DNA sequence: TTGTTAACTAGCCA
DNA sequence: ATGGCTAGTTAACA
DNA sequence: TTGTTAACTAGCCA
DNA sequence: ATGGCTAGTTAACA
């Protein structure tokens, strides 16, 4: 694999201490959200208090891996957030809550409340001097639409010209299983997603930490943007299938 | 005033007792944020833990008005919900966190975060057995949506016949100072939001209590839809503006 | 145009 | 305390 | 077509 | 301690 690009098939509760600490950048999170759902494990399938003390527990070894100007998000359902963000507030500062709308519904077939269509994202950071480069995660407008949205009064500005900030809902479907990006994984990460986080947050040859990841989004992300990265996944197909996205970009 | 509907130029924490317990079937709550803003009074100018100990504190004497098969919606904002929800996740049931997708960004300057454009809803419930009807609002669709979604796999179905679950993200634009159901408040709350929430939680009949009710946005719904309702505001500009509302129906 | 499916069924009754 | 049966659930990819 | 604005800048310096 | 100054912020209503 390219240079800094670490695929580790390893669990990352016995293997973080072989991580340097103050030495991760950013920190790209999709953990076990607690919804049950079959990873060739039961790494899903704890719920209630024990989720909550297993979250503590591996958030415990990897917050010290953040760099000083390193950032974190971290994937969560609504059934865990408030707990999950109001402990990590007692450890960093939330810049962020980044709501991932998946435009695609969960099915089920309840009619005794709303159907779940949004994931939460919430955005840590070690200190106020944390790194964020929102440039290169602007959103340009086509043609059309900067003609809708001029005027005199914002000519020149940055975000008409440039492009806008993604704000802190991201409208972005979920990949469907017949998706060109699709992979054998369950629970997969549009990319789109994940290069905007490191991107804005993650200095360009910096490194990035993910610990649960799956099908190597992140490294994918890394990979492209060139930047750094560590992770670990348990499953070794998803780890294989890891190699394989990035050994074809 | 209508009857039914019951408006009130009082704290709700000191006129609560009042209120008779578990009576209310649906409480619309949408409470100052804690954000820094001018209602005529300070009461946004709290924050810390001074917000949340006053955010609990009214929360404790309005959930006793719930009856059995109650249900509550209250706004907060990303930087106080995590703590709001975690608390009363200890008292009731949450069944839902619903997204309100305003749209339209928050503004100030920034560049070293992401812009806000989601408030963020806690539906709560007192019991397992909580009042809740989706029919009366299902979204249906138009001819080209029905004809895009229409699969005979799916031909039949409530959902695609009568119409589809809102979901838990509300994309609905905040409300233009120069937009028609635009009134004189700084944080008005659009009627299309409030009025699910009284669809699908309150029978028709039922009463609805609104703590802070500004400018009577949950009034309106209510006399639209043939609810009952109790209502506090301290600002009588407000009070008045929420009896025109009423008024002109 | 169409087959298919994606992190987040549930209330009774037995 | 625990299943299983029912009526029920969408947007967008190929 | 264009004016206008909405629940949530942020760091520096005299 | 405290303004003030800076570069800077969007979709949609009328
Ligand atoms: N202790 C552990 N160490 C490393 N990985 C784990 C551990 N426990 C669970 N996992 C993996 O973490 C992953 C969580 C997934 N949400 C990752 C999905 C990934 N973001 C993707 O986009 O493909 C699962 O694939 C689990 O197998
Ligand atoms: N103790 C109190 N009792 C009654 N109202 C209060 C109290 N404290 C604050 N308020 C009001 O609560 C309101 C909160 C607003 N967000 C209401 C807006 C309302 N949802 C609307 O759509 O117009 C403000 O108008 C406050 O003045
Ligand atoms: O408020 C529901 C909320 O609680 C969670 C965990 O946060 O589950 C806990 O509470 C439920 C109450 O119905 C229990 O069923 C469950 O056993 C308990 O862990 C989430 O499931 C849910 O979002
Ligand atoms: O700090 C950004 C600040 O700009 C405000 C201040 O009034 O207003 C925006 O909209 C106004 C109405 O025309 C413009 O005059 C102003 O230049 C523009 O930035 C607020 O929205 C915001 O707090």
Redesign the pocket.
Known sequence: LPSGIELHNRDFLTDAAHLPDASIDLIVA????????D?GND??KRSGDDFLAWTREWLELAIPKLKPSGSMYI?????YAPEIFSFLKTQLTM?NEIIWD???????????????????IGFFAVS??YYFD?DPV??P?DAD?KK???????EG????E????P??VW?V??????????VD?????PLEIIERMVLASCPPGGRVLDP?M?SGTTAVACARQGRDFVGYEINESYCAIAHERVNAL
């Open positions: 999709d953990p076990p959200y607690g919804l049950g759902k990873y790494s899903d994937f969560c359902t609504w059934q810049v998946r435009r695609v519904p969960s099915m089920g077939g309840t009619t005794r409340r709303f159907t779940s269509v949004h994931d939460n106020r001097a929102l602007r959103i407008y639409t809708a949205r001029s005027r005199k009064l914002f500005s940055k975000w008409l440039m492009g806008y900030n704000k802190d409208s479907s979920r990949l469907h299983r017949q998706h060109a990006e699709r994984h369950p629970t997969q990460k649960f799956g």
